[PDB]
Each structure stands twice: as structure tokens, then as C-alpha cells.
């Protein structure tokens, strides 16, 4: 392991909104595969269904479009039509409260799913432990 194994409570029984305390945006996967954040709770592309592959590993899927969150080779998030190795994330508890998601494929590089204050996604290499951008709270839909 390149990372700790403190896991968040909660489960995957129901879909969730992934709220980023950094700018106050919900993670969004647009039909065209674009990934970003929005403060509009009514948005139909922020409802996400998480599922576990192995303990602590998850897929994060758009309930509206069926797409999987993924991080590509240059650290950019995108919506993938199918589950590949870029769609698995290490879901961990952080600061004894939040949920963080590390790219499994690029786990050794500490690339996280993250949103900037302006609602744009962070590119993998620009994220790291200790940032506010990587902190999420799963909220009921």
C-alpha cells in the first residue's frame, strides 16, 4: 500500500451527492463526458451511485447517464462509458471526517479527485494530501 487504510462510515446502498467544502460545489459528470462542479442542487448530473470493487475501492457512476468517473494518464477527470482501470478510486476517511478519492491507477503519485474554489476540477499532479480541494462529504440525494 502507498496509502493508509482509515475508511469512512456510511455505505453504498443509495446514490449520493459528493459535496466539496473547498468551493461548495457538487461533483458533476456531464453527458458529453465533461467533469466539473456546480452549486446547483437541482442539477440532474450530480447524482452519483458509488459501488465497491474490493474493500476500500470504488466506482463512482452518474445515475443519470451511466458514465463512470475516471482520471486519465495526464490527471484529468472524465466520464468513461465503461469501467476500466482509470475508473477505480481508493475511498478513504480524511481529517477524521471527510471522504477522499485517490486514483487507484496513479496511487503512487497521490493523484486525487478534487474541485477548485471556482468549480473546475483539479488535475491529478496539482492535488496532494492536506488540500481543501480533495475533501468531500457524501450527501443524500
C-alpha torsion sign, points 116, 16, 41, 70: positive
Q: For 30-134, where are the E strands, in sequence order? A: 35-38, 48-52, 57-62, 68-71, 77-80, 89-94, 98-103
- Cell numbers 490527471 label which residue? 75
Q: How far apart are CA 127 and CA 112, in angstroms?
A: 6
**3-class state of residue 24 by DSSP:** coil
**3-class state of residue 16 by DSSP:** strand
CATH of 1-141, one of 3.40.190.10, 2.80.10.50, 3.40.50.300, 3.50.50.100: 2.80.10.50
Annotated binding site for heparin: 22
**3-class state of residue 108 by DSSP:** helix
Residues whose CB falls within 8 Å of the CB of residue 30, separated by 6 or more in sequence, listed in order: 36, 45, 79
Q: What is the dihedral of CA 141, 10, 61, 74, to 10 degrees?
A: 120
- Cell numbers 458529453 label which residue? 32
Annotated binding site: 22
CA 141 to chain CA centroid, Å, is 16
Provide the experimental method for this PDB entry.
X-ray
- Asked if residues 28 and 70 have their Cβ atoms less than 8 Å apart, the reply is no
Q: 51-55 — which CB contacts under 8 Å span 24+ positions?
A: 51/12, 52/12, 53/88, 55/7
- Asked if residues 30 and 45 have their Cβ atoms less than 8 Å apart, the reply is yes
Residue 91 bridge partners (DSSP): 101
The grid coordinates listed for 65 are 447517464
**3-class state of residue 55 by DSSP:** coil
The alpha carbons of the chain give a radius of gyration, in whole angstroms, of: 13
**Resolution in Å, one decimal place:** 1.9
- Asked if residues 119 and 38 have their Cβ atoms less than 8 Å apart, the reply is yes
Amino acid at each position: 500500500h502507498h496509502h493508509h487504510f482509515n475508511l469512512p462510515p456510511g455505505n453504498y446502498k443509495k446514490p449520493k451527492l459528493l459535496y466539496c467544502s473547498n468551493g461548495g460545489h457538487f461533483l458533476r459528470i456531464l453527458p458529453d463526458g465533461t467533469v466539473d462542479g456546480t452549486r446547483d442542487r437541482s442539477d440532474q448530473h450530480i447524482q452519483l451511485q458509488l459501488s465497491a470493487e474490493s474493500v476500500g475501492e470504488v466506482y463512482i457512476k452518474s445515475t443519470e447517464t451511466g458514465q463512470y468517473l475516471a482520471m486519465d494518464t495526464d490527471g484529468l477527470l472524465y466520464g468513461s462509458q465503461t469501467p476500466n482501470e482509470e475508473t477505480l478510486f481508493l475511498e478513504r476517511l480524511e481529517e477524521n471526517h471527510y471522504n477522499t478519492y485517490i486514483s487507484k491507477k496513479h496511487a503512487e503519485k497521490n493523484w486525487f479527485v478534487g474541485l477548485k474554489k471556482n468549480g473546475s476540477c483539479k488535475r491529478g499532479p496539482r492535488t496532494h494530501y492536506g488540500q481543501k480541494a480533495i475533501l468531500f462529504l457524501p450527501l443524500p440525494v
